[PDB]
Design a protein around this ligand. Sequence first.
Ligand SMILES: Nc1nc2c(ncn2[C@@H]2O[C@H](COP(=O)(O)OP(=O)(O)O)[C@@H](O)[C@H]2O)c(=O)[nH]1
Ligand SMILES: [Ca+2]
Ligand SMILES: [Mg+2]
Length: 163
Amino acid sequence: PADFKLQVIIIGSRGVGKTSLMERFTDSTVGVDFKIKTVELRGKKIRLQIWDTAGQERFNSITSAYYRSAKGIILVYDITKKETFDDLPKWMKMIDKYASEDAELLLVGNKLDCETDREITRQQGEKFAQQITGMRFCEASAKDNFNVDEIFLKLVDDILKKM
Ligand SMILES: Nc1nc2c(ncn2[C@@H]2O[C@H](COP(=O)(O)OP(=O)(O)O)[C@@H](O)[C@H]2O)c(=O)[nH]1
Ligand SMILES: [Ca+2]
Ligand SMILES: [Mg+2]
């Protein structure tokens, strides 16, 4: 049996790869889906519930409920679509309103495989995360399976440390 059950949520604007990231890592209720994954991490069995939320603003009200329960939040943008990076303050406002104060946060620049179409630099993503105390950052590619395990596993590691 599992040592821990944890909920994490994936948020961000539409088309950034939130569903692709969740499905690459793993395999009705309005505005949300979820996958369950049992991970082994530092000898601990963790039953992970990953909520995948709607991206459009009209769904903020529904999805807000799932923020409070989240022990970790993955906020995703698309490195090739600058407006998904420009939306991040809106997502940070959603976090301030609804997340737990103790929620762990991770910023992800997804679509690293599309490096030639890059609109946002790595420094931009790093500097954004750095402004938010405790927020981790990395770039990933759901398509190329780069940093996919790592965004979930690192976030889980951060969560477990702080309990
Ligand atoms: N090239 C590339 N395309 C991606 C990546 N991740 C997602 N996509 C594509 O982006 C589009 C939207 O992704 P989706 O998972 O539905 O985004 P969501 O709205 O955030 O759930 C789809 O065409 C995906 O195949 C990636 O890492 N690289
Ligand atoms: Ca990996
Ligand atoms: Mg989706």
